[PDB]
Structure formats: C-alpha cells, structure tokens
Amino acid sequence: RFILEISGDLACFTRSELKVERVSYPVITPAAARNILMAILWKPAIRWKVLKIEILKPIQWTNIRRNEVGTKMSERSGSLYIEDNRQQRASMLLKDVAYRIHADFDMTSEAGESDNYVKFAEMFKRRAKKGQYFHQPYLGCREFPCDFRLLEKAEDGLPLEDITQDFGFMLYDMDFSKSDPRDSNNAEPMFYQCKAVNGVITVPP
RNA sequence: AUUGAAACAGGGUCAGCUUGCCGUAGGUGGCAUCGCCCUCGU
C-alpha cells in the first residue's frame, strides 16, 4: 500500500444537484483521489484503488462570487464577446484543508511488456520523492494547487478522530465500461459515506 | 478520464455657491523708619 498527505488553502468538490451555484462537499471525493494519484503518474495499464481517507483539520467555509460565461465555444463561431453572456456565479469554498490517503493499485487487462509491479511501485516512490507529475493535481478546480508529501505514518498534525456528522449518500466514481476509449458515455456509481469516526473507508463493489 | 475542461465587477461621478465677535467698563480711595548712643585710655 501507500500513504500520502495532501495540503492546500482552498478546495471545492461540487455536488451535482447544485452544480449551477457551487455547493462544495464537506469531505473529499473518493473519485477525486483516483485522479489525484493518476496526476502524478499516468500509464494506460494501471488501475488505482483508494482504501482509507483521513481528515486532518476541522471543516471551515467561506463564500465567493465571480463573473462567468455559460456558452460552450463552437467551431462555427468566431469569438464570444463575453459582455453579452455574463452569468454571475457563487461558490462555497472549503478553507485550509490537508488530507491523508491510504491507497494501492492493480493491473488492467492490457498489461503490456514492462508489466512489472515492482518497477511501477519504485518509479512511483521516485516521483513522489522528487516531485514529478504530468501536472499539478487540483483540489476540485485548477486554481487550487495542492502539495503532497510522501510519508510513512503519523508525520503531520494528529488526525481529528472526533466523531463527526453523517452525510448520507455520496458520489463514488463514474463508470468507464459502456464507453470505448475516450469515455464516450458514462453512468454514476454512488456509495454511502456513513460518517466514519475519523477514517472514511472506501468499500469496493 | 477530478461533476472536471474555458469564465474581468466591470465602465465614470465638484461638495459645492456665502456670512462682523461684535457694540463699553477705574485699580480705585489712604497710611511718619520711626523714638537713641563717647572712639576713649596712654
């Protein structure tokens, strides 16, 4: 397995049912962690899998608004001239978040030639130590860069083990199956968050 | 393959045009620095 910790000032993970005016989750998204790992090192033969997620500091809100346009650009058009399109939008940003993750990975069907578990693990350790990636992982939006330190266990502020509130059902991931290469179309798996005392545990199917 | 991807609170708006701190009213009226002693004695 692997244990990593992420830190940053600001972070939103928007629920679906309010996507129009942002209402971020309280906790991080199990789907999000998958992509955060993939950000460091993407191969077409690796399938990630998240096991444990740990909060570190108490949740804290702030609110914000800025000016937006809501027209996806198209080839037939020449430009946008945003003045004729603006839709002010609001947002519910989490503040001062650092999270801890326990996760591992397995192999896809297309193992390929250099399908060595050990070499992938080794190069992952290398990239984690030196700070290597395709791109800086977001925190739900491109503007909130995060910072990740590869640690073994208990190398940050003591986890906030306090029993916290429920959250009902929560977004899990988005299936890739019925889609060919390049995710033609997808459905939405869910799960039950069920208010883990401190360590939220991602159950597989 | 992050409910992600692209997303200006923007564009300008004098605190201004003016009015006496003035017109007078006393420091007055009146009380002796006095009353007194050697520079002798060769």
| Per-residue three-class SS string for A94-136 | EEEEEEEEEEEEEECCCCCCCCCHHHHHHHHHHHHHHCCCCCC
Structure-token pair, residue A58 = 């108490």
Structure-token pair, residue A113 = 């030639």
**Phi and psi torsions of A36, nearest 5°:** -65, -45
Q: How far apart are CA A163 and CA A46, in angstroms?
A: 35
Does residue A109 reach within 7 angstroms of strand B, measured from its CB? no
In 3D, which of A90, A84, A58 has the Cα closest to residue A165? Answer: A58
Q: Vertex A109, ends A107 and A115: CA angle to 5°?
A: 50
Q: How was this structure determined?
A: cryo-EM
Structure-token pair, residue A204 = 């597989």
* CB atoms closer than 10 angstroms to residue A24: 20
- What's the CA A10/C1' B41 distance, rounded, in angstroms? 123
Does residue A175 reach within 7 angstroms of strand B, measured from its CB? no
- What's the CA A76/C1' B3 distance, rounded, in angstroms? 27
Resolution (Å) of this entry: 3.4
